Structure 1
Amino acid sequence: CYPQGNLSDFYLSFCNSYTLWELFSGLCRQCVEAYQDYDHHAQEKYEEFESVLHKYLQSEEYSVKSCPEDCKIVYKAWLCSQYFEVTQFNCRKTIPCKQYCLEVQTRCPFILPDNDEVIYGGLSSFICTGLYETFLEPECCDVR
Structure 2
Amino acid sequence: CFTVENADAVCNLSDFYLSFCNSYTLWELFSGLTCRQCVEAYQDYDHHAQEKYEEFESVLHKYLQSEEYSVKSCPEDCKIVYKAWLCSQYFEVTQFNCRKTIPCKQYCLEVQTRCPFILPDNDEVIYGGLSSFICTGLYETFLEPECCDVR
What is the TM-score when the length of structure 2 is the normalising length?
0.92
- Distance in 2 separating the partners of 1:136 and 1:72: 24
- Distance in 1 separating the partners of 2:40 and 2:95: 20
Aligned-pair CA distance for 1:136: 1.2
Aligned-pair CA distance for 1:26: 1.1
User: How high is the sequence identity, in percent, across the aligned residues?
Assistant: 99
- Distance in 1 separating the partners of 2:18 and 2:73: 28
SS of residue matched to 1:63: coil
- Distance in 2 separating the partners of 1:78 and 1:117: 28
Q: Which has the larger radius of gyration?
A: 2
- Distance in 1 separating the partners of 2:22 and 2:142: 26
What is the TM-score when the length of structure 1 is the normalising length?
0.96
1:88-122 alpha-carbon deviations (Å, 9 max, x no partner): 00010011000100000000000000000111001
SS of residue matched to 1:116: coil
SS of residue matched to 2:105: helix
The number of aligned residues is 141
- Unaligned stretches of 5+ residues in structure 1: none
Aligned-pair CA distance for 1:12: 0.6
- Distance in 1 separating the partners of 2:42 and 2:93: 12
- Distance in 2 separating the partners of 1:22 and 1:123: 36
Aligned CA-pair RMSD? 0.6
Aligned-pair CA distance for 1:17: 1.1
Aligned-pair CA distance for 1:39: 0.6
- Unaligned stretches of 5+ residues in structure 2: 3-11
Q: Which aligned segments of 4 or more residues in structure 1 are displaced greater than 6 angstroms?
A: none
- Distance in 2 separating the partners of 1:84 and 1:117: 33
SS of residue matched to 2:118: coil
Aligned-pair CA distance for 1:70: 0.4
